[PDB]
Design a protein around this ligand. Structure first.
Ligand SMILES: NC(=O)c1ccc[n+]([C@@H]2O[C@H](COP(=O)([O-])OP(=O)(O)OC[C@H]3O[C@@H](n4cnc5c(N)ncnc54)[C@H](O)[C@@H]3O)[C@@H](O)[C@H]2O)c1
Lengths: 239, 247, 241, 253
């Protein structure tokens, strides 16, 4: 029965950057579908923890700067100790820096790239090693952007990193499919979080809009989807 | 709770070409998710009917050449009687003709384009009107292809039609989002069906999944795109291809 | 010497739909680069002929409905008889029909598809047969749209046909590239051929027929020999935004 | 008269990585079209200098590590001092590192990203500042890849960087097109240069790729001369933010 394919009962999902907005939405969405949650945040995710534990699921709350790639192995070791396994990774921790391209600083380049693409690759690598050891496959969900498709303005490192996310998602699928690993991405549109007439849906997107697609991509219901980016954008890219 | 968003209890789904292969899979998947099915076919979908009814769901079997666009209005009327509404449409009925591009006949062009794109737009329109009348939105799922993205060989009208499907999917979402209608597409990879019956091994080694797709692989994605779980996805094509486009 | 690679002296270009605007621009640009021109139009391209012949180039004006695919072999035979060979095809003849998608007529579907994609495929087939006979390769330039990439509104058959153009361009390259035939497309942006739209064009101006002269000469020349199956946007940055 | 639009007489082009292969091809093509050339290389590009000067054009040879973004301004200042202006930038300097993704080292990440995307953005920024000062527009040509479109294997930082090139090309156009600056990219297909040397030595793999190139041949440096001149010229003035594949039909197949 196909509805069972969406059910994430007994699954363990590690979501970086889930204290608020989109990442919170996705963490709560995965918990609602049955996942226990490991969070990695720089801010304590109390509201998320309350909402996750209120569903009767567990939340392991890890505090770390995701840009420190040497730190990743331990984060995943702790998750594995606490739950026995890690099944799903959502690489949502990210930042944006706005400055005219002609003035753009090296700091505003490095900080964004270090988090939005470099740490995404290395965290995916770290978790994939654990998936392989487990031998039962795994799911990775990266977070792309409309700026994976279009250039935008004043955010060169964000556009670069998000375009890179879409590309590296393809490579990870190509290389790791043999390990039973799916790697896909969600590209949110313009979301009401920390233009409107160009959205066919006529509304801003919300964290709630990412719950369904994230459960879908985290579940057996999307097993033959791999290396692909799915726009959750109210039709932005269509117009 | 989010798992309730995938539940299609009480919905009616019209699927074209569901007697076999991919369409059969989507019809059955939609039925398992709670849908009553309306089939439109050239041959009786006997197996599909038995599997849909075995789940305690209803199946209306309509028979028609989908390429006849004047006959679409009636098919939707027949559905609205009996079931009372139509909430979901899957435009899966299609064909392919293989012939060297330099020799390609007008017949092999028209036959493919009439079904694969023309009939798809006009059926979507017909069902869209019904959606608007009903006033509670709706879902359309078109079927794209790897040949919406890549050219292939010896199938100019197929590549043309499937590329056109990806594009009209965008327009229909743009124009009809205001009516609460989501129009998306699934692009299957290389699937084991009648459509694809050592050349095989070269392709297979370029599918990261390492296996042909199956009708079962479209059940999850089709239920997803037919449900509230995908409400902010519109005008978009999702590849279900085992990583083909990634390689 | 690379500038020689852009020189189209001795070449013959068949352009459909070149009486005005973009098609006229492309025919003139090709003529400026050295091409003699064969036009196919519904009416005499009088102004285009004047401009081409003023450059010292030949113009053969054929009058026909490009949507009649049974007529193509004759059009190509006439071009080959007049000049001895045909080297370049530009499939510009096209139309658009605007009408709400929910009300869209079958006539406004058929009319647009017959010309914008069906005739494009069959004209390309017709000319490709001639290219293969000649044995010196050839060039096909199809005309795509921003609506090959985006949906638009009120023009279902236009979007269908132009999305199809981008796809069939890929397939024709796949099959014919081995013969030295290059099949590519130009996707013009918003051309002068309101403020809301300009503010989303990075270049901050409408495109002009002259903006297609360089790209069409490039894709018709030796300078683009390893480009095949590809659509090039000439859009002032529209798709980037 | 349109052929004049391709003529780069009086123009000055700065090409990074033009000692060999693709970059050398583009430098020579630009020089054949009339450009004086500024090279930025790790060693003196003797062959390229020979060929460019034989055409009657000037070659300013700069030796520098393009990954050092602090040194870019000085490179451009030298160019401007020599010729009075810089009109065209080709961001060709790049590397690739092959290693299983599951094992991929931090070094193989950083070295590739630093050159292939970071330095590309900052060199573009440096030259764009000069274009704005001059007030006569300018051309930037970035170098994408088939791996801007497809994933590949064993080269995560390459795929990341080249996908990022396609994206930043869009943004740079968005911001700078108003100044008559055109930022575009060329995506070479499978070209017979050092980067495909190992691949081409494997007879079996070589044929599997070649059989999937519709043109039925590998690309060569000469195949980028025309497209680079085009993108560096007034003939492409309404093309902006776009990546053009020079791939013999690879992406079409
Ligand atoms: N590898 C693949 O199988 C693949 C890949 C991409 C897209 N597709 C598309 O998926 C769809 C399903 O094809 P398939 O793979 O199951 O093989 P298929 O040929 O068995 O499916 C075609 C379906 O359409 C029906 N049909 C044909 N002509 C019709 C007509 N005139 N009116 C009504 N119904 C008609 C057939 O009876 C059948 O049920 C098609 O649109 C196909 O082009 C398939």
């Amino acid at each position: 029965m196909i509805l069972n394919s969406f059910d994430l009962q007994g699954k363990v999902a590690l979501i970086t950057g889930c204290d608020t907005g989109l990442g919170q939405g996705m963490a709560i969405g995965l918990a609602q579908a049955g996942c226990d949650i490991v969070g990695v945040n720089i801010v304590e995710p109390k509201d998320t923890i309350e909402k996750v534990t209120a569903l009767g699921r567990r939340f392991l709350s890890l505090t770390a700067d995701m840009s420190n790639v040497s730190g990743h192995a331990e984060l995943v070791e702790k998750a594995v100790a606490e739950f026995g396994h890690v099944d799903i990774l959502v690489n949502n921790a990210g930042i944006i820096r706005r400055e005219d391209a002609i003035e753009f600083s090296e700091k505003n380049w490095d900080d964004v790239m270090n988090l939005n693409i470099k740490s995404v690759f290395f965290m995916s690598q770290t978790v994939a090693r654990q998936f392989i050891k487990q031998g039962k496959g795994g799911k990775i969900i990266n977070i792309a952007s409309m700026l994976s498709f279009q250039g935008g303005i004043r955010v060169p490192s964000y556009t670069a990193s998000k375009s890179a996310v879409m590309g590296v998602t393809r490579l990870m699928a190509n290389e790791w499919a043999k390990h039973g690993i799916n790697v896909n991405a969600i590209a949110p549109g313009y979301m009401a979080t920390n233009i409107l007439d160009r959205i066919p849906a006529g509304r801003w997107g919300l964290p709630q809009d990412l719950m369904g697609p994230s459960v879908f991509l985290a579940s057996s219901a999307s097993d033959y989807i791999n290396g692909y980016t799915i726009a959750v954008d109210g039709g932005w890219l269509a117009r």
